[PDB]
Every structure is written in structure tokens, then in C-alpha cells.
Amino acid sequence: EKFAFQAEVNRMMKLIINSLYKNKEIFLRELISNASDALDKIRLISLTDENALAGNEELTVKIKCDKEKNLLHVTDTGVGMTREELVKNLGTIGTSEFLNKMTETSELIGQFGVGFYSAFLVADKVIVTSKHNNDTQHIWESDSNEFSVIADPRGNTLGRGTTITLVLKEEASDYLELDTIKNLVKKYSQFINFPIYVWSSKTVWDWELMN
Numbered sequence: 674e675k676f677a678f679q680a681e682v683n684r685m686m687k688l689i690i691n692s693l694y695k696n697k698e699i700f701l702r703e704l705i706s707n708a709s710d711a712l713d714k715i716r717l718i719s720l721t722d723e724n725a726l727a728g729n730e731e732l733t734v735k736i737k738c739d740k741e742k743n744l745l746h747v748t749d750t751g752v753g754m755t756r757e758e759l760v761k762n763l764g765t766i767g768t769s770e771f772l773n774k775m776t777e778t779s780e781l782i783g784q785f786g787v788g789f790y791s792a793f794l795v796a797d798k799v800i801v802t803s804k805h806n807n808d809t810q811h812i813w814e815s816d817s818n819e820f821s822v823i824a825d826p827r828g829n830t831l832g833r834g835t836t837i838t839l840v841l842k843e844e845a846s847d848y849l850e851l852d853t854i855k856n857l858v859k860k861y862s863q864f865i866n867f868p869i870y871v872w873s874s875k876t877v878w879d880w881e882l883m884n
């Protein structure tokens with residue numbers, strides 16, 4: 674259940690963090706982009722697999738702030754990841770060129786698709802809960818010094834998809850405020866082909882479409 678990151682990933686995390694230290698709000702853009710890509714994947718799979726969406730009929734991205742618990746959640750109903758894929762996609766990585774280029778960054782991060790790691794700019798801990806059609810629900814967690822993957826004792830709660838949960842750093846508290854999040858979500862979801870919602874307040878509470 675316990676794993677060490679590949680050397681290349683450790684180097685990558687430091688590069689990403691040291692480069693975007695002055696543009697931290699970009700992590701949200703990357704998580705939303707990853708979510709969109711995951712949704713494109715299942716949409717493609719559904720063209721050839723009629724039962725592809727049986728675990729969850731919607732294709733959405735839902736974001737909610739848990740201020741009390743100091744958590745930010747970004748959930749998509751994309752293709753999801755099996756246990757082996759969580760370990761492979763998040764723990765390992767022409768990567769040498771990218772790194773060479775990085776060390777020698779915002780646009781490059783998005784192009785190589787390693788924007789996930791920018792979450793460490795605002796979080797002391799990142800948790801990834803995922804359910805893929807070929808596996809049971811699992812949880813990946815990391816403080817960046819190592820990571821672990823365990824079967825989710827809550828069972829299959831996602832249906833299908835992935836939830837990125839960020840335990841925000843003391844100084845990243847602003848990202849728990851609806852205004853801030855709504856504002857950022859609207860900016861980075863403008864060109865996403867899937868509907869993105871934010872659990873917001875009007876005091877009654879409900880999902881609010883951002884794009």
C-alpha cells in the first residue's frame with residue numbers, strides 16, 4: 674500500500690512548485706483541464722462500449738469547498754483510474770526533454786499534462802479517490818514525500834470517476850471562499866466542453882453552473 678515516487682516525479686514536483694510560486698491559482702486550471710480530459714476519455718469509450726456509463730450517467734465536474742474541514746474537492750465523472758493506474762499515473766512519468774526545458778513554465782505544464790502536481794502549491798496533502806469500470810474504488814494520498822494507495826473502505830461511492838481532495842495550507846485559506854472559487858472556476862472553465870458546477874449558497878444550498 675505504500676510507495677515512493679519515481680526520481681523523475683520528485684524532480685518534476687520541485688520544478689513545478691518553484692516555477693509557479695507566484696501564480697498559484699493555476700492549479701485549479703490544471704485540475705479542471707485534467708477533469709475535462711478524463712471526461713473526453715469516457716465519452717470516447719462510450720461510443721464503442723454501450724455499457725460504459727452504467728456506473729454514473731452524468732458527464733460533469735463538480736467542485737465544493739469544505740471550509741470547516743479545510744478541504745477543496747474537485748470531482749469528475751470521467752473514465753477514472755484502476756488501482757494500478759493510480760500508482761502509474763501519479764507516481765511515475767520524452768520526459769527528459771520536458772524536464773530539460775523546465776529547468777532551462779505555465780504553458781509547458783499544461784502541454785505535458787503534469788499540472789496535477791501544482792496542487793502541492795496550495796496543499797499540504799493531496800488525496801485522489803477514483804473508480805474505474807474495471808476496478809473497485811481506491812484512494813491515493815500523498816504529502817509529496819511518499820504516497821499510499823488503499824481500497825476505499827466506503828465502497829463504490831463515485832459510481833465512476835475521480836475526486837481530487839486538497840487539504841489546504843494555512844495560507845491558502847482563500848480558496849475555501851465561494852467568491853474566490855466561483856470566480857476562478859468561471860475563468861478556467863470558459864472553454865471546457867463539459868458543465869462545471871460549484872456547490873454554492875443563495876440560506877439554501879445547491880449546485881451552480883459556472884460555464
Ligand SMILES: C[C@@H]1C[C@H]2O[C@@H]2/C=C\C=C\C(=O)Cc2c(Cl)c(O)cc(O)c2C(=O)O1
Pocket residue numbers: 703704707708710711712714749751752753754762763786789834835837
Ligand atoms: C487517467 C485519467 C484520464 C487521462 O487522460 C486524462 C488526463 C490527465 C490525467 C492526469 C492524472 O494523472 C489523473 C487525473 C487527475 Cl490528476 C485529475 O485531477 C482528474 C482526473 O479525472 C484524472 C484521471 O482520471 O485521469
